[PDB]
Design a protein around this ligand. Structure first.
Ligand SMILES: [Mg+2]
Ligand SMILES: [Mg+2]
Ligand SMILES: [Mg+2]
Ligand SMILES: [Mg+2]
Ligand SMILES: [Mg+2]
Ligand SMILES: [Mg+2]
Ligand SMILES: [Mg+2]
Ligand SMILES: [Mg+2]
Ligand SMILES: [Mg+2]
Ligand SMILES: [Mg+2]
Ligand SMILES: [Mg+2]
Ligand SMILES: [Mg+2]
Ligand SMILES: [Mg+2]
Ligand SMILES: [Mg+2]
Ligand SMILES: [Mg+2]
Lengths: 172, 170, 171, 171, 171, 172
């Protein structure tokens, strides 16, 4: 296995395409749950240690994950490249399309139903995906086909992106 | 008869006696609402959670499953219940049919995104979890609203009373 | 007490006991709806028709209406007012009946399809007017929400049947 | 492994193997759609009904759903998620299936005609809710474009069946 | 197997192996698009055109279609259904193909500009119509979002090619 | 005379450009009447024996007729090629334009007034014409200029198509 690792200053993050346990400590509860979902659905192991508001943390974590993904992508030579996933979450349906293209581009098309989920600013979801996709040099389209519950909306998007990414990273 | 199960840690029992209810979900607003449910349904609830959306949904799923155990044991019951509840400006109607056809029609646009720290979008999630897992057909209608706490309380009181009516032995 | 008559071939009896019902209208869908009526109203119905769906549905409703009226006239103290809401998956119906002696139907239900099987759905309002007017009831039928026509009609039959049985209850 | 039950008289079995399918629902159109289901899901279905279309259609859906749940409960690792697009000339349908344990159907398809032959087109949604809710699946059915009602329903049945088949694939 | 024919002079062959492709249509933009087709479908194309863009584009599409039909007729068991989403910066396209034997194209893409370079953009639909009808496929082409015309028609070519390659996969 | 014949399995169909009696047994009453009209107005003799819902039957009959027409067209070398017919049916007026072009294409522009005529699903009319036109490799435009009665609408369309086809098949 390859492990890609980065310290940015206060974050310490590693990612790996093996099946080791993930340890996610962002200091943001909702972000913890979402990145735990990312690890399971992408097949990638994340270890995050953050020290220190939610905006800087979420964005800086997204930037580092994107940068480490690019390192991972650079070292792979032959992969599926294209991944599409539909995920339903009760009333919600999301579609995410990723192309490991080297052309950094995000089309984010999801009007989330509430301004917060618990204490988490829902506007941070697009900021996270922008940071990851652009720094990983992916072309990604995120579409909320229908929604209703904001937790479901965000979760479907995280599940679909992770799975689509996983599919695209599959060795050829 | 006591129906119970476990499902973080969640321990819940429900019973149609008048034993005291102990409700500790870890969510203040949900405690108050489920306290209302016990009173208006006549069902005793005991809930122990140690560990908001996952908690709320988990509790609703377990309540619904336990309700189905209870219903399966009952032979002869009223089956149909309707209740209107006013809360100042608010008026809600809930209609329940213990039909064995799991179906929720939830028609209530709540006035605010939160009450205290509680996400109001959780109300629909709780009711869907209960109704579907209890195999009820339930229509919840907010005829008029205004104050979000009143809207939610009216819906809880109406559902609970309508359920209590439908569960009544014949 | 049994109330009965013929309308000529049509022969129908109604009773407020728990005796069995035999319903042979020659219209399958109507058979199923009248079976719902007997169960939810608490009344026993026996119908023998012999010998188009319009005439048969309407004739049955008129005779049922007239027989209900006989039964009402014999009763002294009854509840008089009945309301029932019935949900049927997507559908919610409300029916309000008043045994007032003032024959009046307010029928507010746009049914989703022109037929269920071979049965013309326009016959549902025709059945209810025949019953309500001839029994001298005041009734309001409201489809609060709908979607499936079989569900819409069944909800209405159930709600009306139960609201009538409530209203007919001895006092 | 074979999954089996009876409920009118209804007798149904399902199996994730290649045994032959005998489908006799009493409803010609539903016979055809269930034949598509077997071929496209890879699940063998045997159905014998003896004993309106509404009750038959819904009762079959409920049992198929209950038997799918038996099958799912035995399976350990499976793909879980399935999506299928099926074109039928002018029609395009998409069906997304999640074997989630959370019973939920989003049915988004405005069918072009009230009937295909003698079959009430509103029965299609009733069938899918019966299966999906009782199998504890989350499914979204979407008619992306349509035109001809037989094509619309056929595309939906093919897409759902294929998506279920994908989701059930052992890991 | 190599499928070839000639139809100004046009000579084309197509093969389901990894032989290099030589594409000389006399239309620069079409050369690039067909090179994308070769790579994404896995099919080797060889084209010699000797001798307006309309006639060449349409004739090439017809011959490719007819040769694909020859290939399909030779194959026994194949996947049959393929769907591909392809993003191209701002653009997202979806193509659904079904090797059905029912020739049908649903082309749903309003392209942003009348020309890319000297190439008439209205020729893209004409190309796909020629291919899809003559290969006897049912395909739906959908531009979900666009912006840049080069990106729009590259996304469409990529998605069709992949969807076809998937559908052509032996089972 | 040439006779073109096909068995597809349960249909047995022959078509001929002579003037022999037609025997049409599709198992669909309304389709029987329409194909009887086709035979008279096109000048082509049809013999159909079908064994066995209406959708599959109508479509399969349309497909075979289209395929046999193509065989017939292939063997003719010199014909008028272009045919246009207007047919009035009381309130209804239809126009059908056919080009024996070899480019399979149907433009069907007729909103029929009712969902059924007797027991026949009126949506089958377009399915029939699509099957015939595409498999015969005709370019055909069908236009209901005005309508009112669905039986008249379908009949005018069948009459006009048959006549236009007949005209186009005329030897040159
Ligand atoms: Mg960019
Ligand atoms: Mg949830
Ligand atoms: Mg979650
Ligand atoms: Mg309160
Ligand atoms: Mg009348
Ligand atoms: Mg039903
Ligand atoms: Mg019924
Ligand atoms: Mg049809
Ligand atoms: Mg067809
Ligand atoms: Mg079919
Ligand atoms: Mg052209
Ligand atoms: Mg480019
Ligand atoms: Mg390019
Ligand atoms: Mg065409
Ligand atoms: Mg005529």
């Amino acid at each position: 296995a390859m492990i890609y690792q980065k310290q940015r200053n206060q974050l310490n993050i590693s990612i790996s395409d093996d099946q080791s346990p993930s340890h996610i400590n962002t200091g943001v509860g909702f972000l913890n749950h979402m990145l735990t979902l990312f690890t399971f659905h992408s097949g990638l192991s994340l270890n995050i240690e953050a020290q220190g508001d939610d905006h800087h943390v979420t964005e800086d974590i997204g930037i580092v994950i994107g940068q480490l993904l690019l390192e991972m992508i650079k070292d792979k030579k032959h992969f599926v490249r294209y991944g599409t996933m539909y995920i339903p979450m009760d009333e919600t349906l999301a579609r995410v399309v990723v192309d490991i293209s080297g052309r950094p581009y995000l089309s984010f098309n999801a009007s989330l139903s509430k301004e917060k989920v618990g204490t988490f600013d829902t506007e941070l979801v697009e900021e996270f995906f922008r940071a990851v996709v652009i720094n990983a040099r992916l072309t990604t389209h995120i579409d909320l086909i229908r929604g209703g519950n904001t937790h479901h909306e965000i979760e479907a998007i995280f599940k679909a992106f992770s799975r689509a990414l996983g599919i695209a990273l599959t060795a050829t």
